[PDB]
Symmetry: D3
Subunit: 135 residues, 6 copies
């Protein structure tokens, strides 16, 4: 948990966030455990969806899209390693709904760089016993 190591991880989240394909906001989220990146998620439409555009015609977000934290945890369910006891490097502070599942997933600590508009997500993670660090 060396400051040089943690920076490389947060920079990895930022770098996978640049795949997002969304134009509103590009969000990334990786799962880190035992020196391994078990899942990297970013915001976008479901797999095999008829479009990878995240926006509607009024430029608002397609309700079908999944958050970064959503995709990361869903991917973990698809993987064969556990998410429990792992850490989470987000480019943005997570959504309150996502924070609910992140805590229930037994994630010990969530790292976020940028603060989203709304900040109740951080507040949910803390109530549910998950340590938070801004970097």
């Amino acid at each position: 948990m060396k400051p040089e190591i943690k920076e490389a991880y947060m920079k990895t989240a930022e770098l996978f966030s640049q795949v997002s394909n969304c134009k509103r906001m590009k969000v990334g989220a990786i799962v880190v455990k035992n020196g391994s990146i078990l899942a990297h998620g970013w915001n976008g439409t479901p797999s095999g969806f008829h479009t990878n555009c995240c926006e509607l015609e009024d430029g608002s977000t397609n309700p079908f899209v999944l958050h970064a934290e959503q995709n990361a945890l869903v991917k973990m369910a698809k993987s064969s390693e556990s998410i429990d006891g792992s850490e989470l490097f987000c480019t943005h502070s997570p959504c309150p709904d996502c924070s609910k599942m992140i805590a229930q997933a037994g994630v010990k600590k969530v790292y976020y760089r940028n603060e989203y508009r709304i900040t109740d997500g951080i507040d949910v993670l803390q109530q549910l016993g998950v340590e938070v660090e801004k970097m």
Copy 2:
């Protein structure tokens, strides 16, 4: 998947719905794969939460409670082995939100007994490719 085994799976879903401490609705969700129940999830408040009562007064559901699908999905993240290519036995038809993550998790089919008030998740499921059976 003989139909006497399919029933046993579905009744197992109902058994674990009965241990839920929500009184608006008791919902259970089962993950089945290779002759194994990898996760049994029921609706309720997060782990270590101060109260295990899922209601507010108003008869309203506490915004912090997790769906039976959310829990089953999260436990699949929590543990090893994969939710991918598995089948889901629910007591009630799942909501739009969970049906998004279910499809992204590569769940082949969703088995549900009761149809909820609104049935958009059912039509969200087969629109994202997940097969759907009512029993």
Copy 3:
């Protein structure tokens, strides 16, 4: 870890015993660990056998049939999951030979509902340091 969840597992064991085609006695046994039902076995003929019938033409039990415990054990052998540390829910008390293999399997505890005429299997379990509870 909870009495109602405990009662759910045992009632799941009874659900699967009813799937058995056997006429003499329908036995079920499931493998539980970390909230996951890793194996659920019931008595019957081996896979692909010419009959799913468990009895010969004189009413006695076919020597090719497997116990519920044998199947619960064998599926763990077919699994990519470990039976070591698991607990066992059976509708009946396992036979001396199954018990012999159950202890060697590293099963912490055996739950059982119906006491079987001849109870040496229980005795074998206690002897080999396996916790046993009737319910």
Copy 4:
């Protein structure tokens, strides 16, 4: 397959049959899959049993002892790999009971050196679609 690799596995069985303490008969059984020894078992008392001697005070076999094939299967259960689609190398042809479970496990083929007194184990193995080879 290659001939000299085949002999290596079989004499490994004879090698581990020799670490058994039983005097009546020393049996060894190795499970092989994808060119890997996933389990090696021999006959003896359960783990942590008070004595490692397998004989009664009259030369008979303690009904508590495990067959080499039994330990090989139980070990596979504790293992985190599948015995399904594997090959088994025994020093002696297995008994009917183990033969039942061997077939149910999904064992492709059984290699054996010595042919036991009673040969109805090979019978059982063959009827259940398990190929057999003496070497």
Copy 5:
């Protein structure tokens, strides 16, 4: 067959973890990717607990005890409880012949590398042993 923006994202991840190498003659990184997950990030350096994390001797040449990024990547996979078989590799620098041997036997499908090393002969071993190679 990998989407170009993701393929780029992994290769840059290898470059990020190569910056932790502590070696000063050349910083090497190696990523193990299977099923969209990064199972191992390895970089060149001394072994665990070694008296120095300094990779070089008094003359500017590499300490023989220094492990390659590819060695660390595969050793990690060995200690790791997942398989390296059927996975692909992201290297900042093309692997050496000795490592390429182990890489091939490890059942690695493909090797992406960004920097061509002075000596090609590592890539030769990869290609001849049926492991795909792509420079980017």
Copy 6:
């Protein structure tokens, strides 16, 4: 660890050294952990390599040939179990190169029978933590 079983592990390494197609020397390596053989490797050309002959016409060794230790190491990377905390049984003492990787892998101890021409490999193991016993 028991003497009867420690020798069985060593002889197992020798059985697998005998399947090497190298006429220059025949080496074998066994990984043992929690009383189980996890990997077995010997010296030879890579898999699917056009020839299985380890030597050139000059008589010297083909540089494509892996040591018995690289094979045991790689097979462990291919494996789904962990090499860290295990013991390594070798027919001959490993080279310094393989010794570095052995040490980094967290191998507790290395049993060996024959010392190689060069004995530098042992010294490297000693220095890097790995315990060494000649047997």
